[PDB]
Amino acid sequence: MDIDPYKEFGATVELLSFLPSDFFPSVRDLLDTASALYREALESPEHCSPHHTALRQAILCWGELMTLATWVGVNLEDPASRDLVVSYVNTNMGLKLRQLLWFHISCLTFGRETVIEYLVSFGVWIRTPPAYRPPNAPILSTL
Amino acid sequence: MDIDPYKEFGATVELLSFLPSDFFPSVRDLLDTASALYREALESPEHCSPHHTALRQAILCWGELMTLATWVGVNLEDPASRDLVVSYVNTNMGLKLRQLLWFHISCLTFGRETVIEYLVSFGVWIRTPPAYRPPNAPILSTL
Amino acid sequence: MDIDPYKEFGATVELLSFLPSDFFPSVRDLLDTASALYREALESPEHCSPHHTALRQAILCWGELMTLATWVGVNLEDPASRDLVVSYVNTNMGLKLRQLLWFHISCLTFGRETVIEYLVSFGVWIRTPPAYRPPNAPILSTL
Amino acid sequence: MDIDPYKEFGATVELLSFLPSDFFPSVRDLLDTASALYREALESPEHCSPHHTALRQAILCWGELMTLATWVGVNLEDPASRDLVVSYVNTNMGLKLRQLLWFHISCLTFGRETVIEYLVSFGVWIRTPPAYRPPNAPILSTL
């Protein structure tokens, strides 16, 4: 199957490619934001929203990757392989996980429609070449 | 955090640990089933159900894990360590995957409540001594 | 004081005495069933039913007998006596714990009156010599 | 499972640990009290109260510990190991059984609320430094 995780929620993998990969915060920072703002809802037995369901799945996927990294560090004996796998699991997969975390956290905090319009506007800003690019980049905010 | 992926659906990691690990179908079989029965809906841009959202997320997590397996095959030179990582992925993460997929596919097929009652019943059955239980292992059916 | 643990619940040690030893599930299986089916309630601050109260007391009693078994294994350097005590605890006391656990779990699952009628019928069946009874014992089950 | 025997009764293991171990009466004295006051209701086929249910279970747990002690005395011929097991069963497990018996007998006699208030008061008295601790330790009374 060809499943786009954002196709529900009115976005696409291509739209989020407007944002550069180095734009997204670290998984630690994003999980801290999730705990700060939505811990009780995430731990709840309610389907509070599709975003909440998806964020739950993403947090668990990251947790299982961390369990794998620990298991590698304990059960592998070749340090080169140990560290290659650990770094891969921390960086390459972390990128997509923090895309997902960012999208859903931002849509809960600010609104799905607002986030999609931020994506469009930031794509404008970032495609605008530097000579003509304003310094005030689009930024998600309430106030 | 402490997120149980089944409690928003009325179940628990414990309750799915109540069935034996070997009862759960293979990942290949479950993904074939997911495709055959719900590919169009999973690929669609609609929040068809929380089961569908969870299932999309899990299918993509497993896809990234398979991608990890391939990346290891290529960029690892220790065959013992490569085999060890691939086997951890196929077995330990695969079991959690097939529990999750079995649960959500079976919910969509038969009913979430039917599935939870089936878990309880089948666990009690597999624990009852044979001379004092119905002889055939319970099964879900739509016929 | 001469207390019967089932008289409270409409049954009697004499009624459950007709159930053979091979009829009851293991202590581990019964405890896993208790957890899976009624953990939220057993761990709760509510009197949910006399069966729940009794089940809590029985589970904690077994926990203390297991503490005893561990203590024996760690403190007695005479292997014969060590194993003799462990076997007594796991067989003679395990059997009573299994009787009680089965009774209360089955009551919660099926109905106290249903369990009592099942015991009456099972006693009839087991008192009947094999030549003159159906070969399959009566079944208490969800299916 | 992690079951607190007093949660359903408004207390905790933390609150009963306000009392020292050497504060609780002997199992003999507690059983004599239970007989002399509530034998009729404990021997009865009625759920008189959750406390009565729990007391019945405790009484039978102690009966089984006594049976184990007798069986050890008969079936172990290494006096050392016999004595170790008998002492453990009479002392270490006796402690928890007399906590339980004291709690439920005192509840039946005085009120569960009165017993919980007695626990917080004894906490005050025992945490108070000696130079200001009144000789009259708190005590339960009906007058």
Residue numbers in the entry:
A (entry chain D), B (entry chain C), C (entry chain B), D (entry chain A): 1 to 143
What does the article say, verbatim?
The envelope with the surface proteins surrounds an icosahedral capsid that is formed by 240 copies of the core protein (HBc). The building block of the capsids are dimers of HBc, which consist of an N-terminal alpha-helical assembly domain and a largely unstructured C-terminal domain (CTD).
Intrigued by the changes in the rotamer conformation of Phe-97, we revisited the mutant HBc-F97L, which is a naturally occurring variant with an immature secretion phenotype. Interestingly, in the absence of TX100, the side chain densities of Leu-97 in chains A and D (L97*) pointed towards the center of the spike similar as Phe-97 in “conformation 1” of wt HBc whereas the densities of Leu-97 in chains B and C pointed towards the side of the spike similar as Phe-97 in “conformation 2” of wt HBc. Thus, the two Leu-97 in a dimer are in different rotamer conformations in the absence of TX100.
